[PDB]
Amino acid sequence: PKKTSFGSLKDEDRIFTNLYGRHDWRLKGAQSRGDWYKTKEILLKGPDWILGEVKTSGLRGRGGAGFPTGLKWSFMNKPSDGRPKYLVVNADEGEPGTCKDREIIRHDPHKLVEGCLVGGRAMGARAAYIYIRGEFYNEASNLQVAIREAYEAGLIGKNACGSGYDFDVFVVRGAGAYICGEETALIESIEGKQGKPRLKPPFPADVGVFGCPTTVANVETVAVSPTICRRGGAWFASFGRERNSGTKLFNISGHVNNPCTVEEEMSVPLKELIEKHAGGVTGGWDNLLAVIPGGSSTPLIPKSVCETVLMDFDALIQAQTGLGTAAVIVMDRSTDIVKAIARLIEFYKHESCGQCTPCREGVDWMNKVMARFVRGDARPAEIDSLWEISKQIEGHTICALGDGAAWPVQGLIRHFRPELEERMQQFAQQHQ
Amino acid sequence: TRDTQLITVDEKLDITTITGVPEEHIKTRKARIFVPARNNMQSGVNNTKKWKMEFDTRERWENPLMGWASTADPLSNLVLTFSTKEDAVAFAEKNGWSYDVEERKVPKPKSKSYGANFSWNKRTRVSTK
Amino acid sequence: EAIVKNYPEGHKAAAVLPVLDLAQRQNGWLPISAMNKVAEILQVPPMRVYEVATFYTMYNRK
Numbered sequence: 347p348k349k350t351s352f353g354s355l356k357d358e359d360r361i362f363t364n365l366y367g368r369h370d371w372r373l374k375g376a377q378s379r380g381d382w383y384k385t386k387e388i389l390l391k392g393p394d395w396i397l398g399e400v401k402t403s404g405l406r407g408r409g410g411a412g413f414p415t416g417l418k419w420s421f422m423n424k425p426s427d428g429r430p431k432y433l434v435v436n437a438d439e440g441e442p443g444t445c446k447d448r449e450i451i452r453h454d455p456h457k458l459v460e461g462c463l464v465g466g467r468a469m470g471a472r473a474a475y476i477y478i479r480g481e482f483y484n485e486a487s488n489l490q491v492a493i494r495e496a497y498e499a500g501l502i503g504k505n506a507c508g509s510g511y512d513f514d515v516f517v518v519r520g521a522g523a524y525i526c527g528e529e530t531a532l533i534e535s536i537e538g539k540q541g542k543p544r545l546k547p548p549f550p551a552d553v554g555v556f557g558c559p560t561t562v563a564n565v566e567t568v569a570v571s572p573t574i575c576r577r578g579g580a581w582f583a584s585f586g587r588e589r590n591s592g593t594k595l596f597n598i599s600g601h602v603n604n605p606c607t608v609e610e611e612m613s614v615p616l617k618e619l620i621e622k623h624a625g626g627v628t629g630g631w632d633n634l635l636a637v638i639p640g641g642s643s644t645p646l647i648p649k650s651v652c653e654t655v656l657m658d659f660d661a662l663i664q665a666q667t668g669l670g671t672a673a674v675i676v677m678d679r680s681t682d683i684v685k686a687i688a689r690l691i692e693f694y695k696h697e698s699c700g701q702c703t704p705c706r707e708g709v710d711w712m713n714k715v716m717a718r719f720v721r722g723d724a725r726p727a728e729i730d731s732l733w734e735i736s737k738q739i740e741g742h743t744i745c746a747l748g749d750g751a752a753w754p755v756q757g758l759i760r761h762f763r764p765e766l767e768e769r770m771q772q773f774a775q776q777h778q
Numbered sequence: 779t780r781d782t783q784l785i786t787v788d789e790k791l792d793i794t795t796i797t798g799v800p801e802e803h804i805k806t807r808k809a810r811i812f813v814p815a816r817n818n819m820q821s822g823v824n825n826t827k828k829w830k831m832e833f834d835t836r837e838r839w840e841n842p843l844m845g846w847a848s849t850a851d852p853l854s855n856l857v858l859t860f861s862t863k864e865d866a867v868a869f870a871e872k873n874g875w876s877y878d879v880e881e882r883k884v885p886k887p888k889s890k891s892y893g894a895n896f897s898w899n900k901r902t903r904v905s906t907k
Numbered sequence: 908e909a910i911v912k913n914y915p916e917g918h919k920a921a922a923v924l925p926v927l928d929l930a931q932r933q934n935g936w937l938p939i940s941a942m943n944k945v946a947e948i949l950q951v952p953p954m955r956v957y958e959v960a961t962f963y964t965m966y967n968r969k
């Protein structure tokens with residue numbers, strides 16, 4: 347029956363077979379690895395069949411929120427009200443510690459392009475706008491070159507793959523804002539405005555880019571759809587736990603011997619993932635201080651939790667953190683944990699779009715308090731003050747960037763309050 | 779029930795002769811019964827909920843000594859608050875004051891929609907957020 | 908004109924970001940004259956371009 351331990355994924359089950367760019371990344375290389383194979387038959391089965399496969403696979407968003415992808419793509423499976431329907435692929439990839447989306451674009455720019463056609467067909471869209479980080483200039487070019495080849499081969503454009511379905515794939519480059527990864531702020535950027543997220547309940551599936559139905563999906567979420575439709579949703583569901591099905595890309599960075607990007611089965615133990623693929627922690631699994639398991643947005647967890655925690659949404663939620671983008675950041679015992687988290691709050695203070703009050707003023711307020719905790723120029727009573735300020739940002743903002751700046755502070759105060767208080771005693775006795 | 783031996787008085791109530799007000803400030807004044815306009819510098823609407831009765835403004839001259847504003851009008855600061863228009867009109871009639879009544883101006887209901895800010899083919903689309 | 912045709916008719920303001928970048932690539936930075944010229948060809952108010960130029964970090968205003 348079901349499994350208990352997860353990991354040790356065979357290469358024949360991996361989806362991104364050119365993750366390290368050691369084969370041809372152009373059309374001929376992609377086709378030899380299975381890309382664009384029998385894509386016409388996928389299209390002719392209609393949106394219902396494609397949406398069914400994603401539902402069965404239990405796939406969940408890979409951008410950081412983890413909503414059920416198959417259920418999220420069914421909002422666009424409605425009749426036409428006279429407006430065009432678009433698909434926006436989120437390639438902003440701005441979360442600190444996250445590098446997975448860079449490799450998919452630069453080394454497999456035909457699973458992404460094929461994903462747009464299959465994902466677009468499910469939603470009934472006419473075209474796909476791929477929003478790629480503005481600093482990824484070289485990656486955007488390879489994406490354009492692959493898109494050009496797809497057009498020349500008849501794989502996209504008019505009568506895509508001989509299916510009678512017209513689909514155009516456009517690439518639009520950002521201009522250097524982390525907030526443009528947010529789905530609505532991404533849409534506002536495509537429309538020529540500032541990267542300021544919109545409010546809901548006007549949802550992108552009802553009023554989106556150019557005021558039209560749209561779906562915003564991560565590159566990894568879109569770059570695995572064609573494989574699921576071919577190998578089946580049953581095959582994809584065979585990995586990871588229940589409700590955490592699938593293979594996941596991981597970025598293991600920080601204080602590890604061999605920082606790298608690898609693909610691994612969901613629910614893989616955190617200790618195994620670092621040891622097996624990343625060469626372990628610098629100084630062995632005893633110099634470990636804390637880990638940020640899902641990019642800067644997620645709270646850190648200390649060594650005690652890291653012993654047995656599994657890398658999936660449900661397991662990390664129970665550990666008072668999240669999976670996020672599966673961007674594992676490892677910090678050893680030589681790290682200034684207060685200073686490491688202070689730089690993350692400075693990052694969010696430089697990336698706040700500045701629209702809504704709690705994160706315009708609150709994040710800039712958390713940054714200044716953190717800048718004093720690092721030096722210890724604060725009282726212990728300000729730790730609880732910092733906690734309360736954090737809870738006033740979380741849930742009161744337009745977008746989740748405010749939430750993503752509260753959680754790192756809360757993680758620091760949850761597990762490392764003794765460190766913060768000791769830092770303040772040292773300053774107090776020195777600066778009498 | 780009310781065993782008091784009441785009488786009948788079929789004339790309009792009028793107390794001008796027993797309120798002690800001089801004749802000059804009964805027959806020459808003009809009361810204004812109105813709901814105050816919202817102060818346009820603020821969005822609050824708590825001062826637009828009751829009817830007021832104010833009187834006509836009269837001369838104010840500068841005090842020769844200090845330049846202070848002087849008045850000979852004893853009713854210049856008189857403002858009365860009433861719960862309804864009919865109550866205000868009743869109070870003016872029984873005091874012998876001629877009054878102008880201005881019907882309450884209520885904001886009309888408005889159709890608001892955050893989604894109209896991003897319309898596909900309408901002019902409600904905003905160029906900035 | 909190739910960039911402008913990547914967006915639906917009646918939404919030419921969607922081309923501010925790529926056309927501002929193209930101006931910077933030609934010039935190396937964005938003088939106030941460059942911002943106004945992008946506003947003219949796209950028929951967008953100049954202040955809307957100033958908002959985009961000041962919002963994004965990659966644009967060089969010096």
Ligand SMILES: Cc1cc2nc3c(=O)[nH]c(=O)nc-3n(C[C@H](O)[C@H](O)[C@H](O)COP(=O)(O)O)c2cc1C
Nearest residue numbers: 407408409436439440527528529563564567746747
């Ligand atoms: C501040 C912020 C930054 C984000 N950056 C990204 C990103 O770079 N790539 C991505 O796929 N999703 C990002 N997201 C999540 C998106 O808003 C959205 O949840 C996701 O792209 C939807 O696609 P999915 O189903 O593949 O997850 C970000 C969210 C926030 C609040």
Ligand code: SF4
Nearest residue numbers: 699701702705745748
């Ligand atoms: S939380 Fe911050 S980044 Fe998000 S909309 Fe509000 S001000 Fe902008």
